[PDB]
Symmetry: C2
Subunit: 374 residues, 2 copies
């Protein structure tokens, strides 16, 4: 059988179980937006309920795929071909099952991903019985992942996450270009979990497919990017995402997906389509997250906060102890980064999820700083 490790929220619940907060404070643990779904998205759903009698297609509707491609064009200035994008039921399932698809017939497969990480990457490796090569992200090299020469020759699949959960670290165009060249040189599959690409403060982060265009890999050979609508549009219930890149791998993945049953109501797909076609509402939410990061940066003195994602990777003496103290005294919930990593990576940090409207964060963030400062 497979091993079922506890999830970060269970480890946190366990840590705080013996504590009764002396005050009421904000929950900055869970990275899930606290905003209403835009009305026009809801109205699209309401206006198409009649399609509930239609068995949805595993490929999703053509109109949704086209809306997703249009998004990629406007956002990354790349015109994806029809066989270069597959519609998916959010990103979670794709991140979990794509590796079992691509490494299906491999003997002793090896997957690389950063440390700390969104735990689904490890689940994915366990499901295909792969060896995991963890690329630590620490301050010693400005949270930069790398592999040595032997590792580059052994690895079969590399998963990056840029912008990164939980550090916010975002790889530059030049950094992504190096990875593309390594993927082509050593012949391994390279994926970027790009679910935070619309959560940024100033300059938009680059897609790994842009690196492909500039590295002479316009066909996106060995390379794929995974996107989701959940954070961008405050509509996680729609379960809409996509995977774009290598058309040879995607054409085979399409056939595999016929069997999986990851389908959604046509009415849900219409609302997803309306969301992907519009940029206004996305910008409205991005601006709030932009202002959250700015506020945090003013408050947490001499702390590095990258202008991407909606997280703060906060240095503390011990994350677990800091979480306990803050909850006990202020009722403010934070996530020790230890619970997102292996080999004790994250021990000196708590992750903060700035998922509230900016004015609600001013007080709690100041309070947090008072417990941290000298």
């Amino acid at each position: 059988g497979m091993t079922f490790e506890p999830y970060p929220f269970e480890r946190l619940r366990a840590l705080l179980k013996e504590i009764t907060p002396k005050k009421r404070g904000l929950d900055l643990g869970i990275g899930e937006p606290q905003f209403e779904t835009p009305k026009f998205i809801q109205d699209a759903l309401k206006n198409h309920t009649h399609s509930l009698n239609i068995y949805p297609k595993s490929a999703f509707e053509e109109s949704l795929r086209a809306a997703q491609r249009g998004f990629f064009k406007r956002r990354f200035k790349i015109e994806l071909k029809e066989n270069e994008l597959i519609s998916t039921l959010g990103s979670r399932e794709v991140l979990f099952n794509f590796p079992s698809f691509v490494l299906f017939d491999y003997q002793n497969p090896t997957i690389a991903y950063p440390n700390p990480f969104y735990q689904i990457y490890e689940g994915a490796a366990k499901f295909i019985k792969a060896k995991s090569l963890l690329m630590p992200l620490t301050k010693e090299n400005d949270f930069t992942p790398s592999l040595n020469e032997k590792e580059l020759q052994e690895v079969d699949l590399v998963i990056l996450n840029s912008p990164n959960n939980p550090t916010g670290r975002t790889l530059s165009l030049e950094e992504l270009i190096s990875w593309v060249k390594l993927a082509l040189k050593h012949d391994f599959i390279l994926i970027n979990d790009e679910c935070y690409s619309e959560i940024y403060e100033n300059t938009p982060p680059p897609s790994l497919l842009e690196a492909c265009m500039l590295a002479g890999n316009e066909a996106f050979k060995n390379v794929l990017v995974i996107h989701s609508l959940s954070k961008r549009s405050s509509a996680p219930g729609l379960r809409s995402g996509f995977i774009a890149g290598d058309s040879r791998l995607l054409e085979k993945y399409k056939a595999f997906r016929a069997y999986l049953g990851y389908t959604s109501a046509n009415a849900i797909q219409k609302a997803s389509e309306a969301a992907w076609l519009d940029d206004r509402h996305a910008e409205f939410f991005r601006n709030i997250y932009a202002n959250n990061l700015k506020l945090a940066r003013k408050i947490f003195k001499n702390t590095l906060i990258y202008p991407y994602s909606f997280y703060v990777y906060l240095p503390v003496q011990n994350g677990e102890n800091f979480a306990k103290t803050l909850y006990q005294n202020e009722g403010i919930i934070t996530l020790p980064a230890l619970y997102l990593g292996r080999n004790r990576i994250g021990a000196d940090y708590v992750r903060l999820a700035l998922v509230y409207d900016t004015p609600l964060l001013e007080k709690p963030l100041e309070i947090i700083e008072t417990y941290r400062e000298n």
Copy 2:
């Protein structure tokens, strides 16, 4: 990884050169052609505000309770909280449950009937299992069976009663025999019960009722898979469940947390409404019942079981028959060969009686005329 063409692809290929001389009805699609009840559509419209919430892999407790209530009303068995898991319809469960249960087995072996709903084979191939096909034929009264050697060798057995495509439905006594073999030869037994609400007069029994009568009230080694799709003419809702052995379901739950088969809370509310009401189900059942009686009237001296909405129609050669009716009448029928292996189904076409009764009269009579004269 190898991909076997789907039946619809084989049908498309068979009919590609032919230009139909007349427009005719499509009797190849096994999906209801009825509108989704208005109250189900209204339930979805009224809960659109919940799109901002990340759905849970376990689904909402209110949905689970509604599915447990259905089971009690329908089969007179009160499932405990740990004995039912909500799912995204039945397709995904039929594909991934075998991967879950046989995950680390040595030489996994699965049995299922022949002909069959083709996902059973996909599921077996994914887990790299050997398939033991149990042929359903006129000569064996469409009865699945396994010999002594096979019973010791088998790890998982999938039944489907009522059956797609033959309509064969196992009696309570036959199900009891299977429960006893499951325990005696220590294998996992599953019934795909998605046609359990599609019957003409006497309701078919559930495999779990046989458990109660066989002294297996904890449903050890036994599970049943259900779906709302055909019952409520709402395949777009993507709602089903698996019920039985809580020891297996406790771990399957943990596995499902990684898979990402989740659904908007709004969609789940519409599903809950459908599972709570028997009136709309009965309305549709009455149509399918009338459809079976009409077919039985038209196809003289032809066995049509009073379960499912299929006609397993004996013809000289299924492929040739389908080609002739499409060419002359434009009526689309499914050669049963495309649902079986080892030439099983060669002399049958399957008809899906999924339209309102008056729409079926002329086409069914036409079909009978081609049988009567070569």
